[PDB]
């Protein structure tokens, strides 16, 4: 007991010492020479209306045109973003969903929430109507994020402080990730889908190997629950937004926090985090009804996306980077260019 605690403290001190040793310079001073990105003046091109309750999640399609969104009114709407048309409207058995996912193939849509179940719906049914294809039982806590890893397996995080990789065909948890202490609030899959980072309410982010099933690295620094997480386009770094007014960019190879994105004028929490296609811009939705576009390299606030009358609960960037879709608690989705 006491000896094990002492050994754990010694290991933590050794990890901190190694991190301090490998932190010769800082990201701010290295990117101090490069020219600023300027002022981001993205404008609302589309407004997807039709949701009647707070929108809790959205996810772009890999074609960068179709877009799934989840609302608290028990609706999962698949939008044609180019024409604003509603391709699909799935009635959810539970109206308390807080996440939604779009399959990279586009054949399936995942959703989940306070019912502790991930529902996989088949959009390409031969009958022409969308029906739920799978319901994943497990996660004795509320399911907060789901990300498709091909069409047969999916990684889902829940409020029972665990994540799980499920085989959709069998409906069983292939792998379970049980390192987090607080409720896991967000997931992000790496571009190669071999690793994924999960941020939890313990103010900690964890990097998990999907194949191995073990935690590779643990990242700290946030002073409150981490609500959003996102990989850099390179896959060698990630960004976390938390209940405090700061985002933080961590690097996997350095195992350290590279950058912090905070302002005195910002005091509210951060709900969503996403990078642009190049990773130069970091887009974060806040509780103050706005989205902030930071210069991820220079930590400077490049721009403000305003136009949501309520809290921006979710935002994503297309795979080609043409647009940014932000959903809000005001039951509205706004697409920005």
């Amino acid at each position: 007991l006491d000896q094990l605690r002492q050994e754990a403290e010694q290991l933590k001190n050794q990890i901190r010492d190694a991190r301090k040793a490998c932190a010769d310079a800082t990201l701010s001073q290295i990117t101090n020479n490069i020219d600023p990105v300027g002022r981001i003046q993205m404008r609302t091109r589309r407004t997807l209306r039709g949701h009647l309750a707070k929108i809790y999640a959205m996810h772009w399609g890999t074609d960068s045109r179709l877009l799934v969104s989840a609302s608290q009114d028990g609706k999962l709407i698949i939008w044609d973003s180019y024409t604003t048309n509603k391709v699909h409207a799935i009635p959810l058995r539970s109206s308390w969903v807080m996440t939604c996912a779009y399959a990279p193939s586009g054949n399936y849509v995942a959703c989940g929430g306070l019912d502790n179940i991930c529902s996989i719906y088949n959009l390409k049914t031969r009958e022409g109507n969308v029906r739920v294809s799978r319901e994943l039982a497990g996660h004795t806590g509320y399911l907060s994020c789901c990300r498709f890893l091909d069409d047969n397996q999916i990684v889902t995080s829940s409020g029972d402080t665990t994540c799980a990789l499920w085989d959709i065909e069998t409906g069983q948890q292939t792998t379970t990730f049980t390192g987090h202490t607080g409720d896991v609030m967000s997931l992000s899959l790496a571009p190669d889908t071999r690793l994924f980072v999960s941020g939890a309410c313990d103010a900690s982010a964890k990097l998990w190997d999907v194949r191995e099933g073990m935690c590779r690295q643990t990242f700290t620094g946030h002073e409150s629950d981490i609500n959003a997480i996102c990989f850099f386009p390179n896959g060698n770094a990630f960004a976390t937004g938390s209940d405090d007014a700061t985002c933080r960019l961590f690097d996997l190879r350095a195992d350290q926090e590279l950058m912090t994105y905070s302002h005195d004028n910002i005091i509210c929490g951060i709900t969503s985090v996403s990078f642009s296609k190049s990773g130069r811009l970091l887009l974060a939705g806040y509780d103050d009804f706005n989205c902030n576009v930071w210069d991820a390299l220079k930590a400077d606030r490049a721009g403000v996306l305003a136009g949501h009358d309520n809290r921006v609960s979710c935002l994503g960037v297309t795979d080609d980077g043409m647009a940014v879709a932000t959903g809000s608690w005001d039951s509205f989705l706004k697409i920005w260019n």
Partner: peptide, 13 residues
């Protein structure tokens, strides 16, 4: 639920 209420109580606003 046995989870943190602060993370999902706002769903019942």
């Amino acid at each position: 639920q046995r989870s943190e209420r602060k993370k999902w109580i706002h769903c019942f606003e």
